[PDB]
From a paper:
The small protein AcrZ in [name] interacts with the transmembrane portion of the multidrug efflux pump [name] and increases resistance of the bacterium to a subset of the antibiotic substrates of that transporter. [name] is the energy-transducing component of a tripartite multidrug efflux machinery that includes the outer membrane protein TolC and the periplasmic bridging partner AcrA. To investigate how AcrZ affects [name], we determined cryo-EM structures of [name] and the AcrBZ complex reconstituted in a disc in which a bilayer of E. coli lipids is encircled by the membrane scaffold protein saposin A (Frauenfeld et al., 2016). Trimeric [name] cycles through three states in the transport process, and [name] associates with the subunits in the loose (L) and tight (T) states, but not with the periplasmic region of the open state (O).
To test the effects of cardiolipin on the conformation of [name] and AcrBZ, we reconstituted the proteins into saposin discs in which the E. coli lipids were supplemented with an additional 5% cardiolipin (i.e., to ∼10% total abundance). The increase in the cardiolipin content is associated with small changes in PC1/2 and PN2 for [name]. For the [name] set we used minocycline as ligand, and for AcrBZ we used chloramphenicol. Even though chloramphenicol or minocycline was added to other samples as well, density was not observed in this position for the maps for the AcrBZ and [name] structures in the natural lipid composition or [name] with cardiolipin supplement. The structural changes we observe are unlikely due to incubation with different substrates (minocycline versus chloramphenicol), because we do not observe density in the T or L pockets for either minocycline (in [name] ± cardiolipin with saposin A) or chloramphenicol (in the AcrBZ complex without additional cardiolipin with saposin A).
Residue numbers in the entry:
A (entry chain A): 301 to 350
B (entry chain A): 101 to 250
C (entry chain B): 1 to 1033
D (entry chain C): 51 to 100
E (entry chain C): 851 to 900
F (entry chain D): 11 to 166
Amino acid sequence: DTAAAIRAELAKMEPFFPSGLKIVYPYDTTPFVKISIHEVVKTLVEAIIL
Amino acid sequence: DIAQVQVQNKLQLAMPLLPQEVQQQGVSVEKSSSSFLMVVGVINTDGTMTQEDISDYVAANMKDAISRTSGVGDVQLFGSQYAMRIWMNPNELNKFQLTPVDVITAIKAQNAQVAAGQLGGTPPVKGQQLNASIIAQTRLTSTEEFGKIL
Amino acid sequence: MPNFFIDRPIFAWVIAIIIMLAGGLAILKLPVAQYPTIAPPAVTISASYPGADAKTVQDTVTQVIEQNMNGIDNLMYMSSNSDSTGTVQITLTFESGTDADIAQVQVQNKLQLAMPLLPQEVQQQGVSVEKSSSSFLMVVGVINTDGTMTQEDISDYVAANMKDAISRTSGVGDVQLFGSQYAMRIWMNPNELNKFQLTPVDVITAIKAQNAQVAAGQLGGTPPVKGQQLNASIIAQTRLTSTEEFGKILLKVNQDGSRVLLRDVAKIELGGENYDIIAEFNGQPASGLGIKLATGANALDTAAAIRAELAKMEPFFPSGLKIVYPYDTTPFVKISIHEVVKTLVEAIILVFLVMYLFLQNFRATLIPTIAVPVVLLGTFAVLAAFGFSINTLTMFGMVLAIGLLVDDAIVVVENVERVMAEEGLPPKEATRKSMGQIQGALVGIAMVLSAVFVPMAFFGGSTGAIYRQFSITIVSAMALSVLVALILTPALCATMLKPIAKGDHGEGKKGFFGWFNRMFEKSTHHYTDSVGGILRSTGRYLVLYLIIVVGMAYLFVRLPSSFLPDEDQGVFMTMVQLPAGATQERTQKVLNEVTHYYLTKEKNNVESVFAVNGFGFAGRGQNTGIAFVSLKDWADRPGEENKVEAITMRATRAFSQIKDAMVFAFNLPAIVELGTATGFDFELIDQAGLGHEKLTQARNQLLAEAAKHPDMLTSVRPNGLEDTPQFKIDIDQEKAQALGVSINDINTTLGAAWGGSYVNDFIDRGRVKKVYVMSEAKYRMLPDDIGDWYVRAADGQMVPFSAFSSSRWEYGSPRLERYNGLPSMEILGQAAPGKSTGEAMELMEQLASKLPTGVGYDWTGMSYQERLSGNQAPSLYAISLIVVFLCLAALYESWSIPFSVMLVVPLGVIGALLAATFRGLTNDVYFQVGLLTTIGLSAKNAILIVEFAKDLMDKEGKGLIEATLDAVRMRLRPILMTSLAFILGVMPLVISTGAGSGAQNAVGTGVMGGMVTATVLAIFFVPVFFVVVRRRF
Amino acid sequence: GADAKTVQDTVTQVIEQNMNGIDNLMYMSSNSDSTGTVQITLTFESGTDA
Amino acid sequence: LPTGVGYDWTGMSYQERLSGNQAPSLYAISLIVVFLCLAALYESWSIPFS
Amino acid sequence: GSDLGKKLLEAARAGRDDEVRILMANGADVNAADVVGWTPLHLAAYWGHLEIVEVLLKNGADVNAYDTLGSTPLHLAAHFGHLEIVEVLLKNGADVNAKDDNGITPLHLAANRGHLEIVEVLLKYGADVNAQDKFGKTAFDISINNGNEDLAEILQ
């Protein structure tokens, strides 16, 4: 949730950036914790299918 | 929260013991985990933007608005803001019989905002039709204004 | 459960006694306030860097704190306002559900570590973090009739003597002061300082040196010598108590031995700290203090105890002093909470005698008169458990529930009385047979209504705190009503009722009663034949349903949405705003005209006038002013021409003539701390380091381009202030050292002479007061007197300001506001009378996309809660409809049936939408709550029709049509009892003007309208829906 | 260095001036010694979070 | 004592009179809650009186 | 000081041509003055409104008017860089070598900010370059303190 608030606020600045500045995300641990839960969600879905 | 409160209530007894060189830099008390939640990088795609220029913009226009966020206990900047760094030279200071103490005195005597007062203030006299503020000095706000310091 | 509380009646009683006593421990403890804490918690940093401008504060005080408010939890705003008087005010705003104490300490501390960045001239004055409620429980004014006193003496006699006294009082919270406690001020005459070759610097020195406290030590202090028989503290020179003593301090000595003092150079007096504010109670020089409530206390008793504490000290203070109450709301809160008590006790009376009209049996009428008080008292107990309080919202919550309280009693009583009449069965068997029909329908209704009101509690944020009071109250009320209808009411029916044998349908003998029974039977037979005739014809009366739904949806859009009605709290306000560069004398000439108008032309209504010069809203400047107008009791103000909604217009019209003064009179909003008039709080932010001037250009542009669409934007105002003249002195740094003049001498002279410097503290009558130094007005009003101030060089020769300085004028801003760190300026406005707000928002966030490079927009205030909200109500009501459909399919055991019941929600809605249109009533929250109540009890009066018909077609197999006929016949009577009792108990709310008018009417009109329609339409449609659905499935 | 009266005037009567209006407060005592040391003891009701 | 001189308790002496003023309502709320429980258990107003 | 001049002062600072021309139709005073001593000429020259400053002097506005300290509208226009207003108020008879009570010409205000085009505009029309304030400061010394090279060579 904190990371979502931050990824929102950053979008709330890019329009006012001068010519050339760019935002990169070289390090984020959240991309893993919303994939670690998806591959188990679809796992227990395949489970009821099987 | 109450833990940070107790910790910060015990500083108040210690802060008057520290030098005016620490307080003036800003002490910081903060809950925190030891690992970075994340990192956010800023780059000028084209050019004409040195590390210094990107770090300034980051500190000024997107650091404070993120440290105020709810969930962010600590934020570390990979650089620093701007600052009118004044790189001095002794061979030109002993030539004028000067020293850094006089430099600092002149600066902090000429980069200062004075509590001037008020035109047509309070309590006024019967028959006053004017109210204005007074202004004597300002923060030099540039680089070509620090050089004219006498 | 019911068949349990028939052979065990006393058991039921001991519950109804407990949940009665449990209410008494809550009628006496529950805190009584006007409105609960709905606003978002907030705190206000405040700091007065004295004798300053708006940029000095922005750059030395505001930006510093604005950078170090890091790591605060649940933060939404960082609003900030720096003025020209010196006072910065920073207003944060946390979410809903936040502890105010924890947030307040987080701020206190994040500032305590920011303090050693501010100057040595704010740390002294200090800052003050305090919660923002803006809610004066009541204000107290103190006058001297004789005229021997001033504001600066009444203020002191209040602070040193009374502020303490009413602070030990029960539930008093924080006490604010108008005026300023005594302080010794030294007014200097630079024509005399040059003669003695002095300045306002060695004066600062001699006053800091000849008043300070010094530590000395002890005698015989440890470690001692063997043989000491004495220990006693040592006391050196200490503070100066009396002003005369200040005239005895030395500054210098001349060659001839002549000794210089203060008396011969300066003028010493006891006055106030800041003279900017000037209060007047009907022109009488006056002052006062303001009290706001402690969280979790009773306002009525608090005010009755303060009105006593102020008399306990009536005789002690001097003769000529009077105490008046300019602004109080308790005289209105007492009414607002009583006008409902006499409504609830009027409703139990009406439902008692209505059952004397239909049942014609004393023992049958007493039963609800016993159940309804039980339910109300249990509701009070439940509120007391959850920490809730007694408010206007919570009481109106049970007012518009009382119908659901009486409905769950008469449905139990009239059915047992119908059974005892149709079969002659005794009361015990008759009840145990009736509850064999209803015990499940009442639980289904409990679940339905729980699903209907509960979702209202999870809504937006500030409206959440209102809908939540309403929902908690009404849900508690119905949960207890259904229980006492399954616990107590049937036991009462088994004992208090009296046996009647079969054939006692009721014919009546002589009076109203025989006529009424006869006409009831006749109307029943005719209505029954009518419903049969309708059931023969579907389509007709199935297409009228679509006509009604279309009319409802088309009325739901010509209804101007609102939040709360403004009412007559007995007080309103006037605001004066003069041109820039305006003085105090002109503002007081305008406020005295205001006072003369209100005390000469409107003395039949107006009690008093409390004028304050310098205390304006959206500005503390010398330019503006405010006036709190108080009105006589509501019995002394009869009619409609003598209300505030009319005095406001009269006064606005009359003061429109006041030349060179923007005057505006307006009534108080219901929720003071909140925004009013359905406006929007837009604001421009500069995210490219643009100047104040370029952003001002952008704002003027946006305004000039927003008057282009007057169709949805009406009055788009800049809440801020336009730039105003200001005096720029330029200190020549060359010619200042060419003569040997220290610049910290120049700046100090200037600031002390024109702004005032907090020098030290002194003691008076056992209290600490301040020592201010300043010039005498005569010598500091205009330029060209600057040359009168001579500062001292090291060579002794004194130099004027004319040798160092050059002078000029410039238009610099008198107020600089911020938002979330970045500079900004606020822009207000409101949507056109017919257009909604969202349209005005999207329009001017489409007009803001066309502003120069680097200028962005943001919403604040009430408009921020609508960005993160709006899509809550539809989803929550959709899931509520799903819950209702499932709870009814469970009760009837069918997936189709429920729709019949679910097709009477638009009937009770069109009645309210027609009444609120014929009366000009907006779509308040009271209106939505009345819509929901009508929906709930209409669905209740329909659920039982369907349950009766279904049971007749399963247990007795009578058939579809015949069973529906029998059901509409059985249930006709109670439906009219409920509708009639509710209508009669609510009619006073539609008529009652005066106190609680805009709220009583807003509730009762919608309620009555929905009831008429859901009564005379639902008797006819729900059987049609039942038969239709049974045929189609 | 301050005697018992100077501190009841400067230090104590200005703190107990604000300590009124605190929630669930049974009583409050205060002591003002001659060494300048000052103590103020607020006693709240039982069941109160300290 | 002279006029303008009041008295007040504190410490355990405060709780002492607090309990002394509490006990009389306690002995009643604990009786009128036994009467009700008994009348409920046995469904009679005479059994609890006896 | 009349109700027709105050509206001119209000509309010239806010930049309104319709209201200003209307109020001038009704015979309003274009020599109006605030409590500081400012005609709408000063406000226009200060805030950058042309198409208005071109209008006030046609209606008979005093060009060399001075406030309670001696600041003409050239002083205000020459201090911010309104070239299209400087080349106007001079064509209409403004004293380029003027002086406030202090003693500064509009050169001493244009050489401070670096409005070199205005420096040329002014010294084209006889601006004194050997003039001094009450401090003994020319425009050359002021251009040297600020360390400019353009304004250093313009003045030889």
